[PDB]
Amino acid sequence: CVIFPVEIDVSQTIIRDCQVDKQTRELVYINKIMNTQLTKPVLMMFNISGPIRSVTRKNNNLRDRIKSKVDEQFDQLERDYSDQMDIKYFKDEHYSVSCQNGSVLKSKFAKILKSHDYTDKKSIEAYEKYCLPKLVDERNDYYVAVCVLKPGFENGSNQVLSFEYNPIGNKVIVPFAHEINDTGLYEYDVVAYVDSVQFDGEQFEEFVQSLILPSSFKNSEKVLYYNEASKNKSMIYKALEFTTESSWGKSEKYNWKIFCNGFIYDKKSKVLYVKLHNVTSALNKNVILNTIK
Amino acid sequence: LDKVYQMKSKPRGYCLIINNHNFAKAREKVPKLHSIRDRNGTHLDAGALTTTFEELHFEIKPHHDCTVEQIYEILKIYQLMDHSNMDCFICCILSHGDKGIIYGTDGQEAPIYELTSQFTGLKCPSLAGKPKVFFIQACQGDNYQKGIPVETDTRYIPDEADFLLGMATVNNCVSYRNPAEGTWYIQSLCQSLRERCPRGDDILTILTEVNYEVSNKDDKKNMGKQMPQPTFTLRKKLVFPSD
């Protein structure tokens, strides 16, 4: 049964944020860029609820271990009938992470002792207009993690990064935010797994609702929206459904339900399963949650 | 003048349908087979072949999820039996596979040769001279068949005679099974059999059409194409009538 799948194509984004102890959570982040042979210093940033107390590299076996635990949680919704078969640096050689107090990054930004210099203004200039303005706000807190994946990062496995940090105020900021673009629309391709956070349908209805799903190329396709509240569950997601006919005998129909995207919450476990696979939305924001107070 | 296999016997013959569904034991033991899923839908073809070979007066004999070892025994049984009052013997295997093999619930292969040779003229004197049919729905490789554009449409007999062997696919290529409706081959083998049997057409005529259907069936996804391919050492037209 085929061994020719997943390769230089598999690179959406995987994020896992778990509470490791009383006041320390751990962030695991794997993006497309980290999985390619960089030839120059690459820059990337996001938001963290608190300050980073340590940055390390993990084994790629993690990328699938996470994406599984989640993809499965959503797959229980679907009904796919497709044919099957039989001031706080953290230097290192390859990378270089820096964690500053949101607002501080704006005021000094230019300072690239993190060595994203040779990109000069013609390259940094970009990030202050399309990214930076979306990482700092009226809540001058919201620390910004700044990484500079320097070449060599590809060598060996362990492309996954892990941020150990101390949440401030009981807040958790799952980094979905993008790079403000001229067009006005953003395409999401990410799976996240955060735990020890309290539900919040208000912000999940707002997100899921503004999602434009991919097409199955069938006039009869309708995109329904859901808001179930099972036993130990609560799902807010949009799926695409269309009925299908038999391929031989009896006139038995088959009601599909695919491309499900949204948020699933385990009332008991206190875990948040997120899935935004190739969906478009005019909403480009991070998701803020509260740690079980 | 002519020739045709006898099929008068009221209880035509047995129909060991071996339907494999759960390959969990395999997902654990055999390492390579850990990223393997279960054959969801097989039930539609087991309940398809059972219906078909029922109107054709065949005394079906279903078998759960069996492992290689059990399978060998299951065959070693209907081999020591007497098949005189029977004018036909059928055997259907449904499960995963690869290069001329058919995995079992366990995860270890089981060469087709060692399964179909179990019913030679020698091994089963009772079945000598009577057609022994085999339908094998299973992968046979990891490769996908491309699809080119047609732009149309008293004595002694050999020990391995009378043998129809329907292969869900050519060698080296994959077979297709659909969770909602069923597998292409098994389904066509029935929708075409259960229909052409009234009008009295031999199985060899039926399998031709079947290769037609599955050839059109297309894997909308990975541009896939299936292509059955039977083999026979039969001596006379095989045909079974009903009511």
Q: Which residue of A has its CA nearest to B214?
A: A247
Residue A27 neighbours by CB under 8 Å, 6+ apart: A15, A16, A17, A48, A162, A163, A164, A165
**SS3 per residue for chain B:** CCCECCCCCCCCCEEEEEECCCCHHHHHCCCHHHCCCCCCCHHHHHHHHHHHHHHCCCEECCECCCCHHHHHHHHHHHHHCCCCCCCCEEEEEECCEECCEECCCCCCCCCCHHHHHHHCCCCCHHHCCCCEEEEEECCCCCECECCCCCCCCCCCCCCCCCEEEEECCCCCECCEEECCCEEHHHHHHHHCHHHHCCCCCCHHHHHHHHHHHHHHCEECCCCEECCCCCEECCCCECCCCCC
Number of neighbours of residue A207 by Cβ within 10 angstroms: 21
Q: What CA–CA distance (Å, rounded) separates A236 from A227?
A: 5
Cβ atoms of B104 and B68 within 8 Å: the answer is yes
Which has the closest alpha carbon to B18: B117, B112, B140, B126? Answer: B112
Q: Cα–Cα distance between A225 and A240 in angstroms, integer?
A: 9
* Domain CATH for B140: 3.40.50.1460
Could you give the domains of chain A? 1-293 (2.60.250.10)
What's the rounded Cα separation, in Å, for the pair A212 and B146?
34
**In this structure, which amino acid lies at residue A45?**
M
Mutate to test the interface with B, among A4, A9, A76, A85 (most CBs of B within 10 A): A85
CB B207 within 8 A of CB B230: yes
* B36 vs A1, A244, A248: nearest CB: A1
Assess whether B139 carries a catalytic annotation: yes
Residues of B in contact with A247 (CB under 8 A): 178, 181, 187, 217
Strands A171-174 and A24-31: unpaired
- Per the structure, how many domains does chain B have? 1
Cβ A286 vs Cβ A171: under 8 Å: no
The question of whether B88 is a catalytic residue gets the answer no
Phi, psi angles (nearest 5°) of residue A147? -115, 155
C-alpha closest to that of B109 among B75, B55, B71, B65:
B71
What span, in angstroms and rounded, lies between the C-alpha atoms of A103 and B48? 68
Method: X-ray
Q: Which residue has 């799902």 as its token pair?
A: A235
Closest partner residue to B219 (CB to CB) among A3, A4, A83 is A83
Cα gap B99→B123, rounded to integer Å = 25
Tell which residue, A196, A200, A190, has the closest CA to residue A274: A190
The residue in chain B having the minimum alpha-carbon distance to the alpha carbon of residue A248 is: B191
Q: Give pairs for A62-70: CB < 8 Å, separation 24+.
A: A62/A16, A62/A28, A62/A30, A62/A160, A63/A14, A63/A30, A63/A160, A66/A14, A66/A15, A66/A16, A66/A28, A66/A191, A66/A193, A67/A14, A67/A191, A69/A193, A69/A273, A70/A191, A70/A192, A70/A193, A70/A273, A70/A274, A70/A275
Residue type, B220: K
Give the closest residue to B92 by CA, choosing from B127, B42, B57: B42
Residue A157: phi and psi, rounded to 5, are -85, -150
Q: B122 is in which domain, residue-wise?
A: 1-243
Q: Which residues of A fall within a CB distance of 8 Å from B97?
A: 86
CA distance B12 to B15: 10
Of B139, B179, B221, the CB nearest to A86: B139
The Cα–Cα gap between A67 and A192 comes to 8
Angle between helices B203-216 and B184-191 (to 10 degrees): 130
The single residue of B91, B96, B190, B197 carrying the catalytic annotation is B96
Residue B154 C-beta-side C-alpha neighbours within 13 Å: 0
Place of tokens 């060998």: B72
Tokens of A273: 């399963």
C-beta separation of B121 from B157 below 8 A: yes
Q: How far apart are CA B149 and CA B138, in angstroms?
A: 26
Cβ(A160)–Cβ(A62) below 8 Å: yes
At B67, which amino acid appears?
Answer: T
